Ligand binder design. Structure first.
Ligand SMILES: *[C@@H]1O[C@H](CO)[C@@H](O[C@@H]2O[C@H](CO)[C@@H](O[C@H]3O[C@H](CO)[C@@H](O)[C@H](O)[C@@H]3O)[C@H](O)[C@H]2NC(C)=O)[C@H](O)[C@H]1NC(C)=O
Ligand SMILES: *[C@@H]1O[C@H](CO)[C@@H](O[C@H]2O[C@H](CO)[C@@H](O[C@@H]3O[C@H](CO)[C@@H](O)[C@H](O)[C@@H]3O)[C@H](O)[C@H]2NC(C)=O)[C@H](O)[C@H]1NC(C)=O
Ligand SMILES: *[C@@H]1O[C@H](CO)[C@@H](OC2O[C@H](CO)[C@@H](O)[C@H](O)[C@H]2NC(C)=O)[C@H](O)[C@H]1NC(C)=O
Ligand SMILES: *[C@@H]1O[C@H](CO)[C@@H](OC2O[C@H](CO)[C@@H](O)[C@H](O)[C@H]2NC(C)=O)[C@H](O)[C@H]1NC(C)=O
Ligand SMILES: *[C@@H]1O[C@H](CO)[C@@H](O[C@@H]2O[C@H](CO)[C@@H](O)[C@H](O)[C@H]2NC(C)=O)[C@H](O)[C@H]1NC(C)=O
Ligand SMILES: *[C@@H]1O[C@H](CO)[C@@H](O[C@H]2O[C@H](CO)[C@@H](O)[C@H](O)[C@H]2NC(C)=O)[C@H](O)[C@H]1NC(C)=O
Ligand SMILES: *[C@@H]1O[C@H](CO)[C@@H](O)[C@H](O)[C@H]1NC(C)=O
Ligand SMILES: *[C@@H]1O[C@H](CO)[C@@H](O)[C@H](O)[C@H]1NC(C)=O
Ligand SMILES: *[C@@H]1O[C@H](CO)[C@@H](O)[C@H](O)[C@H]1NC(C)=O
Ligand SMILES: *[C@@H]1O[C@H](CO)[C@@H](O)[C@H](O)[C@H]1NC(C)=O
Ligand SMILES: *[C@@H]1O[C@H](CO)[C@@H](O)[C@H](O)[C@H]1NC(C)=O
Ligand SMILES: *[C@@H]1O[C@H](CO)[C@@H](O)[C@H](O)[C@H]1NC(C)=O
Ligand SMILES: *[C@@H]1O[C@H](CO)[C@@H](O)[C@H](O)[C@H]1NC(C)=O
Ligand SMILES: *[C@@H]1O[C@H](CO)[C@@H](O)[C@H](O)[C@H]1NC(C)=O
Ligand SMILES: [Mg+2]
Ligand SMILES: [Mg+2]
Ligand code: NA
Lengths: 14, 185, 594
């Protein structure tokens, strides 16, 4: 089972 | 960034029972706010401080991408496997402290390319093979401990190694030369 | 007699064809007249004909069982999350009644069978999490009733095919996470008039977003993220009447954000971050009640429109790494459950908005490398939701609100490079989750509170470049999780104690440029992980302890103190020449010291 990145906003932050 | 990605790659290959790398969030712009990571004023990693953390597993060649790293502190852990050759790509490294681990394999010849290195402590490991002659070209080397290893062959006594005493090379498998008891064939 | 079947026998052949180590198919007993009560088997007629087989998560291993197609009334087949391997056979078309086929999360390899398009009843095809490779077959353009095509996380290495635009019934196109030969988005995809989802993340897309995509009136999700798309965000995208989510992040997109995006009434999530977008964020877009707006790491300029504060559903605004100017909206957070705010690396000025945490859900306040001025709003002292606070590299002033120090779930508090005045309150004892405290380069005054020692899990204390004074609290030595203590450039006074031995996890101790007095405690040697020690520019007195030579230090400075006696032979070397300068009572075998 390879987990699948959902269709959603990116997550980069300071 | 690239430095954060490289350190995250190390996290996935390390086993971290006490979750010392919990703060190592790859989504962050840089790893400077990560605990055990110190950055310079230009937000480039200059220190990784992971001594006595009960870390096991192996190192990664990706540590070589840390161009401004000056202090690698991975001592007093159960890290196994080879010392990566890509550590020689750490041009600004001042301290390499991999002592009190279960590191096997050769001391990489690449470590000679660490021009600014002042501290090399690889003691209390299972390292095998000869001490590279490249290490003598490190003009800055002021502390060396290769003791309590399974190393063999001639101990270099020229360049940086001129000042080095026996305590540096003690309890090795079959080291020969002037600093040691047995001379070389 | 014409309505007789061998469905039980056919299912036994499927069982024989597949390895079942965990015995999931134990209930399949050849002695049973009908398979209709067997696990994963459904006969929806009651005529004893199999209509559905669901063998999901059964640890079954082996090739696809072609014999299953002999079940004449099979309409639903799921082999999801199994170890089905080898090539998907071309004789799968024999399953002519199939409406749903789920073969996702398997080990299937090779080229897609073109005969999949020869099943007219097929509505749902999911081959996600497989090793399928090669070109998508031209047959796929001719699917009669397909609404869902999912080939996500495969090894498909062909160009994105324009013929997929010819499936008029298609509601979902999911081709994400495939090593596709770099290809443009076909303009024919605009002919998919019933499409609700276009998921093309990490499909090696090149070229411009076609204007045709604007005609997709039923589209709910547009995801073109993690590609190499160039050109402008098309103004035609204003035609996406039903669009809720648009993802264009990490492309090479240029040009201005179209004001036509304001026409999208149903838009809630927009991420066009990590592009090269220029110009100003449009007012019309900010008027839309957005739940997430991410435009970070672009070349955007101008003022953030105040209309963004009007949205009642905003929880995420990340616009860091731009040249945005002016002030934040006054009412930001007043009408929205704001959770994540990141306006860092911008040219923003003026006071922080007063009611950022009005809804009580703010977790991350990140405003670093801005020209924000004034005091921390007193309201934030009651924002118990906060976990990460980064107010560093701003023009802030005044005392920190008392409560702000004691917020319970805050892991990192960073106030570095501001003009903050006042003292750390005794309220700091309440910061149960505080791991990193960075207060360096401020105008902070007063003694460190004893309650700072109540913070058992504190890992970093950095308070350099301040006007802090007084003896260190005895509690500070009780912090056994402390890795970094940096108090350099302060007016700290008094003596270090034997209690420093409890700093067992301390890597760096920097007390330089203070007014510390007394002897260096012999317990300095007990600190196993200490590699950096700076006690320079103090009034430390007495003999350097012998225990110091036990430590493996990469940095030592004891310069400009009142230390007396002899440099032990271990410390009497050329590498320590600059470590012991400015101690008049001190003399060793160093060329320049004495
Ligand atoms: C084709 O791509 C679609 C877009 O990714 C994908 O869709 C979406 O499916 C997920 C299923 O996990 C939905 O998810 C989630 O939200 C609900 C609450 O609404 C949560 O309870 C779940 O845990 C989960 O977080 C998305 O909302 C949904 N989006 C849309 C627009 O439909 C399809 O599943 C893909 N289809 C195939 C066969 O791959
Ligand atoms: C698809 O997966 C199948 C299961 O992993 C795999 O299976 C089958 O092949 C293996 C050999 O690779 C056979 O294994 C053996 O067990 C017998 C005794 O029962 C031994 O004598 C023999 O030496 C071997 O260890 C399996 O018996 C066989 N059948 C089943 C039902 O598992 C396929 O090879 C694989 N196909 C492809 C194309 O990858
Ligand atoms: C490094 O490795 C040394 C060799 O195994 C080890 O050595 C000795 O210490 C033990 C326990 O104190 C003695 O019983 C033994 O006789 C010693 N042997 C030698 C050759 O010195 C060191 O203790 C190890 N160093 C560290 C810091 O753990
Ligand atoms: C952060 O704050 C530092 C202290 O004000 C500041 O510091 C110094 O830089 C000035 C001018 O470049 C020097 O004259 C002074 O000696 C420095 N002092 C110290 C303590 O380092 C930093 O430049 C500030 N950094 C940023 C990014 O604003
Ligand atoms: C230390 O001594 C060794 C052995 O004499 C020196 O080594 C070599 O360098 C020369 C000149 O470039 C090469 O031609 C040889 O092939 C090398 N041999 C070996 C065994 O390494 C080394 O350069 C000396 N280190 C100094 C002077 O720093
Ligand atoms: C576009 O889709 C249509 C069906 O929607 C395809 O149609 C035709 O081709 C089928 C071959 O399988 C025939 O069975 C149909 O009778 C035929 N005509 C119609 C009106 O359906 C067409 O080939 C597809 N074109 C491409 C380029 O893929
Ligand atoms: C370190 O790892 C080795 C090899 O797996 C193991 O035998 C040894 O017991 C470990 N030691 C500690 C202290 O965990
Ligand atoms: C570092 O060294 C390795 C070989 O040891 C080399 O392949 C790699 O390219 C080097 N790093 C960079 C950035 O060039
Ligand atoms: C090491 O030093 C010797 C001279 O002492 C030189 O010939 C050799 O090329 C050097 N190797 C380097 C700098 O890699
Ligand atoms: C996948 O199947 C395995 C057993 O084969 C099971 O343990 C696991 O929970 C399943 N995973 C999912 C996500 O269904
Ligand atoms: C695709 O759309 C265009 C523009 O509306 C139309 O002219 C064309 O006929 C459509 N499809 C095909 C296969 O021609
Ligand atoms: C963005 O894409 C580039 C390649 O175009 C890749 O190297 C980079 O890692 C990606 N970064 C993110 C955060 O998606
Ligand atoms: C502390 O903060 C971290 C990081 O944000 C979070 O994951 C964790 O749940 C917090 N713990 C508590 C008890 O609040
Ligand atoms: C110690 O600090 C002084 C200035 O305060 C400096 O000149 C000296 O080089 C320092 N020594 C070090 C860092 O070893
Ligand atoms: Mg840090
Ligand atoms: Mg048999
Ligand atoms: Na990209």
């Amino acid at each position: 089972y390879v987990p699948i990145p959902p269709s959603a906003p990116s997550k980069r932050h300071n | 960034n690239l430095e954060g990605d490289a350190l995250h790659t190390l996290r996935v290959t390390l086993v971290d029972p006490n979750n010392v790398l919990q703060s190592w969030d790859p989504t962050l712009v840089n790893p400077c706010t990560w605990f055990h990571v110190t950055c310079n004023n230009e937000n480039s990693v200059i220190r990784v401080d992971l001594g006595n953390a009960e870390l096991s597993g192996h190192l990664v060649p990706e540590l070589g991408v840390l161009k401004n790293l000056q202090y690698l502190e991975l001592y007093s852990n159960n890290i196994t496997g080879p010392i990566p050759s890509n550590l020689g790509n750490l041009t600004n490294l001042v301290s390499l402290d991999l002592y009190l681990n279960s590191f096997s394999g050769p001391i990489p010849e690449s470590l000679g390319k660490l021009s600014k290195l002042r501290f090399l402590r690889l003691n209390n490991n299972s390292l095998t093979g000869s001490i590279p002659m490249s290490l003598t070209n490190i003009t800055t080397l002021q502390v060396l401990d290769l003791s309590n290893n399974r190393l063999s062959g001639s101990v270099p006594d020229n360049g940086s190694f001129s000042l080095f005493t026996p305590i540096s090379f003690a309890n090795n498998l079959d080291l020969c030369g002037p600093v040691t008891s047995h001379p070389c064939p | 007699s014409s309505m007789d079947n061998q469905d039980g026998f056919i299912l036994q052949q499927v069982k024989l064809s597949l390895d079942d180590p965990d015995s999931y198919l134990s209930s399949w007993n050849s002695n049973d007249a009908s398979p209709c009560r067997w696990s994963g088997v459904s006969c929806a007629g009651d005529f004893s004909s199999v209509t559905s087989v669901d063998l999901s998560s059964a640890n079954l291993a082996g090739p696809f069982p072609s014999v299953i197609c002999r079940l004449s009334n099979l309409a639903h087949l799921s082999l999801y999350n199994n170890s089905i391997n080898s090539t998907l056979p071309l004789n799968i078309a024999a399953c002519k009644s199939l409406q749903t086929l789920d073969l996702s999360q398997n080990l299937l390899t090779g080229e897609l069978p073109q005969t999949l398009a020869d099943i007219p009843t097929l509505v749902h095809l999911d081959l996600t999490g497989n090793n399928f490779s090669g070109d998508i077959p031209a047959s796929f353009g001719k699917f009669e009733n397909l609404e869902v095509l999912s080939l996500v996380y495969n090894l498909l290495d062909g160009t994105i095919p324009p013929f997929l635009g010819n499936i008029s019934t298609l509601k979902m196109l999911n081709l994400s996470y495939n090593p596709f030969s770099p290809s443009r988005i076909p303009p024919e995809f605009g002919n998919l008039t019933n499409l609700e989802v276009m998921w093309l993340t990490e499909c090696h897309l090149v070229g411009q977003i076609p204007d045709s995509l604007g005609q997709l009136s039923k589209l709910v999700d547009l995801d073109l993220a993690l590609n190499d798309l160039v050109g402008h965000i098309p103004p035609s995208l204003g035609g996406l009447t039903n669009v809720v989510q648009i993802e264009l992040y990490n492309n090479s997109l240029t040009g201005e954000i179209p004001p036509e995006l304001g026409n999208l009434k149903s838009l809630r999530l927009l991420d066009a971050s990590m592009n090269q977008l220029t110009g100003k964020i449009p007012d019309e877009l900010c008027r839309v009640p957005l739940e997430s707006l991410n435009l970070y790491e672009n070349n955007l300029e101008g003022e953030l429109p105040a209309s963004i504060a009007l949205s009642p559903n905003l929880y995420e605004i990340r616009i860091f790494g731009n040249r945005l100017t002016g002030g934040l909206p006054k009412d930001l957070g007043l009408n929205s459950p704001l959770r994540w705010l990141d306006v860092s690396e911008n040219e923003f000025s003026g006071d922080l908005p007063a009611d950022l945490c009005a809804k009580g859900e703010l977790e991350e306040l990140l405003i670093i490398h801005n020209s924000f001025s004034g005091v921390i709003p007193e309201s934030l002292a009651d924002c118990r939701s906060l976990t990460r606070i980064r107010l560093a590299y701003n023009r802030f002033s005044g005392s920190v609100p008392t409560g702000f120090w004691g917020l319970p779930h805050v892991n990192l508090l960073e106030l570095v490079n501001n003009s903050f005045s006042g003292e750390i309150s005794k309220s700091i004892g309440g910061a149960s989750n505080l791991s990193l405290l960075i207060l360096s380069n401020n105008e902070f005054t007063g003694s460190l509170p004893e309650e700072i020692g109540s913070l058992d899990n504190l890992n970093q204390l950095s308070a350099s470049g301040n006007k802090f004074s007084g003896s260190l609290p005895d509690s500070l030595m009780s912090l056994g999780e402390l890795g970094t203590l940096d108090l350099h450039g302060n007016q700290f006074s008094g003596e270090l104690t034997s209690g420093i031995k409890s700093w067992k996890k301390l890597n760096e101790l920097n007390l330089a440029d203070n007014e510390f007095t007394g002897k260096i405690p012999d317990e300095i040697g007990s600190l196993s992980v200490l590699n950096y020690l700076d006690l320079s520019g103090n009034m430390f007195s007495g003999k350097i302890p012998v225990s110091l030579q036990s430590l493996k230090l990469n940095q030592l400075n004891l310069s400009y103190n009142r230390l007396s006696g002899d440099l032990p032979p271990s410390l009497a070397k050329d590498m320590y020449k600059n470590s012991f300068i400015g101690n008049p009572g001190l003399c060793g075998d160093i060329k320049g010291l004495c």
